[PDB]
């Protein structure tokens, strides 16, 4: 049981903590964005109607 | 307006922190009980601030921390309502729990899974604080059921004490029988007002709104101790004394009354509830006081006393003094906990002998616990200025001053007497007669972790009642115009109880042989109500679940009907269609019948 506990905590923390840290760095440096109204000369793209940087990044790269 | 929410979330964060530590690997290196005790102390010191700001502003507060979902016009979110009730109950509960944790750290040495015990305690504490300072009835149900399961575990901590398992099962059954009416209320409100929150429910202050009130009423009768569903409070005592106090002196029972009082706005415009709150709560001040005259176990006696006080508070609710009821909860907690604390000290000093019948001379052999026990006993009797008075006597004013049902009033006063009766019973049988306990002695109470908590709790039980009665905003308008024989009734009648208990306890001597009289036998055996209920209801319900459903429906008929019938049918048809022997003399006759049939069919049909 000590073994299961320790190994699960490892194989979680291992990538949970680096990821959470990347998330914090993103929220701090990049952070969220603004509700800039729509100009009459620009036709926004699917990677610009979403707020969060990670969300719009994925929507621009993959989807 | 930022320090407030800061504190109100910081207390929960503190209580979390240990639990988190439980996950980690430090416990095997660290003194988890002291860790948790001190975190609780600082949680209390924090909770104090709200009290100052609230008495200095009287500004209630309402918060919506986190938005959970949005279920199509019926949202949900972690909403708190820091008003008088909860902002005070947090402080009281912590002031008690700190002492309880020290007492446990001292009382449960020689046991390995003590850190487990502490984690369970603080989990219950978090759940109760949620229930207390919660606004959404859903959050409140969360607190409800979490408290239930925590009590289950704690009554069962010794998972070999067979009857303890049954006690826990009792508890769960009755708490669920309350949850029934609670879900009834939730549903009625989510339908007729679209919301679960007290804010948007207050607007039901005009309609019949009687079914949800019946639901909350059953919830009270269940989670607290009342006539139909008390029997689960005495059995918990099978568990340890610290929890038998915390979970059964100031928590897990006050929950129902807390709920009713938070819902009071709708109870002032329903003259039926106002009544049924008297034929249900005052009665319990009799059907337990009776059982609190012969019971020998200290903890059983204390639990019956608790049921009595809770019935008294439901009565004052019925007659509309809810802030009085709440103040009484607060005060009552202090000494009802110190009593269990002293009893646990006594027991651990001795060889696990709860019975009064085998103890005595406790004053001389152990002055401290006896002094504190006398303090608590007189406070519960209603001594004029020991934080019992400041609620009990106003309640006994109103009970006779208002249009209260006669029999209810009457049995209530009888119970106010029986309080002093069994208190002096404790006193005599434990503190004034001879040392009828075994010869060996290994007493020790000079330990600080067991001498300081009682001291703090005594100071509290002596001061906090007065402090609160003079510092809280004057919610209601009292009545200070009546005769002396109605302003001093509780005092007079408690003195009467003292005298009568003295006379009778002294009559216990004189070689007046005893006789098994039926009134006293009834009292001792609770009234035979468990003895019949728990012996017929289970039997019949289980015998039905076996005979009718399992055998006579699910193994007999629903198989003989569809599948076995199809089987027999097709089997017989196959027997027929393959009973044939290989004779052309017959096969050709059959061919001929078929030819005839076909010709005739064509002829008819043209």
């Amino acid at each position: 049981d000590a073994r299961f506990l320790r190994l699960m905590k490892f194989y979680l923390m291992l990538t949970g903590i680096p990821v959470i840290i990347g998330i914090t760095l993103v929220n701090i440096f990049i952070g969220e964005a603004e509700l800039a109204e729509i100009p009459e000369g620009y036709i926004p793209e699917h990677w610009e109607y979403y707020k969060h940087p990670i969300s719009r990044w994925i929507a621009r790269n993959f989807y | 307006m930022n320090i407030f929410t800061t504190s109100i979330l910081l207390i929960f964060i503190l209580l979390l922190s240990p639990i988190l530590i439980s996950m980690s690997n430090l416990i095997k290196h660290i003194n988890f009980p002291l860790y948790t005790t001190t975190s609780i102390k600082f949680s209390f010191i924090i909770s104090l601030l709200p009290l100052l700001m609230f008495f200095h502003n009287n500004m209630e507060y309402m918060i919506t921390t986190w938005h959970w979902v949005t279920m199509n016009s019926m949202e949900l979110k972690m909403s708190f309502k820091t008003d008088f009730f909860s902002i005070l109950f947090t402080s009281v509960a912590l002031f008690v729990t700190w002492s309880i944790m020290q007492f446990s750290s001292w009382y449960m040495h020689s046991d390995p899974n003590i850190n487990r015990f502490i984690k369970y305690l603080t989990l219950f504490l978090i759940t109760m604080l949620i229930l207390t300072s919660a606004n959404n009835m859903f959050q409140l149900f969360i607190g409800w059921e979490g408290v239930g399961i925590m009590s289950f575990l704690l009554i069962g901590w010794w998972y070999g004490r067979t009857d303890a398992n049954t006690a826990a099962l009792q508890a769960i059954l009755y708490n669920r029988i309350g949850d029934i009416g609670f879900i009834l209320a939730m549903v009625w409100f989510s339908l007729n007002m679209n919301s679960w929150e007290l804010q948007q429910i207050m607007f039901s202050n005009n309609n019949d709104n009687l079914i949800p009130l019946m639901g909350l009423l059953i919830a009270a009768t269940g989670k607290s101790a009342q006539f139909g569903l008390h029997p689960w409070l005495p059995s918990a005592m099978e568990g340890p004394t610290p929890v038998s106090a915390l979970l059964h002196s100031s928590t897990m029972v006050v929950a129902g009354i807390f709920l009713l009082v938070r819902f009071h706005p709708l109870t002032t415009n329903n003259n039926f509830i106002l009544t049924t709150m008297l034929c249900l709560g005052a009665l319990t001040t009799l059907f337990t006081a009776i059982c609190a005259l012969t019971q020998n176990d200290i903890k059983k006696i204390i639990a019956f006393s608790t049921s009595s006080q809770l019935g008294l508070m439901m009565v004052t609710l019925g007659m509309n003094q809810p802030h009085l009821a709440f103040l009484h909860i607060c005060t009552h907690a202090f000494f009802k906990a110190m009593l269990f604390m002293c009893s646990g000290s006594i027991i651990h000093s001795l060889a696990d002998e709860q019975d009064i019948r085998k103890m005595g001379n406790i004053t001389k052999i152990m002055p401290f616990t006896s002094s504190c026990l006398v303090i608590g006993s007189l406070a519960l009797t209603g001594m004029p200025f020991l934080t019992g008075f400041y609620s009990k006597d106003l309640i006994i004013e109103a009970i006779n001053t208002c249009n209260t049902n006669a029999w209810a009033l009457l049995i209530t006063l009888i119970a106010t007497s029986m309080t002093a009766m069994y208190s002096m019973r404790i006193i005599y049988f434990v503190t004034m007669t001879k040392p009828r306990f075994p010869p060996l002695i290994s007493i020790n109470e000079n330990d600080p972790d067991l001498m300081n908590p009682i001291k703090r709790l005594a100071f509290g039980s002596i001061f906090a009642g007065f402090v609160i009665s003079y510092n809280i905003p004057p919610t209601s308008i009292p009545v200070l115009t009546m005769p002396w024989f109605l302003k001093t009734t509780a005092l007079i009648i408690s003195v009467l109880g003292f005298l009568i208990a003295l006379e009778l306890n002294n009559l216990t001597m004189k070689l007046s042989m005893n006789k098994a009289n039926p009134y006293s036998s009834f009292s001792t055996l609770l009234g035979f109500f468990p003895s019949i209920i728990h012996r017929i209801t289970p039997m019949k319900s289980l015998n039905l679940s076996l005979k009718t459903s399992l055998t006579l429906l699910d193994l007999i008929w629903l198989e003989k009907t569809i599948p076995k019938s199809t089987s027999t049918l097709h089997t017989n048809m196959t027997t027929l269609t393959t009973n044939q022997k290989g004779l052309i003399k017959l096969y050709f006759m059959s061919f001929l019948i078929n030819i005839i049939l076909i010709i005739i069919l064509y002829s008819i049909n043209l």
Binding site: - | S110, H348, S349, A351, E353, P438, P439, L440, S442, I443, N444
Partner: protein, 88 residues
Amino acid sequence: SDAPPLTLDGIKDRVLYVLKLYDKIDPEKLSVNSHFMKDLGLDSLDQVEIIMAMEDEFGFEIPDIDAEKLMCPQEIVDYIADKKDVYE
């Protein structure tokens, strides 16, 4: 608040203390093997009351199956020792 465990010398001294405070037949001089019915001409009533006094002296209870058969202080002590698991 746990006191220390029990040893054979303590048990024996206590049992002699009690069986000496007894008054009916004991001539205040009990051999460890001072058989009750045989070597002291005692009664079943007396033996049972002795067992009960010992039960009260040591808190626990002695079942009838063995109360009826105990006929020696040494046997009482052996029983208590095999029940409390003393003398590591």
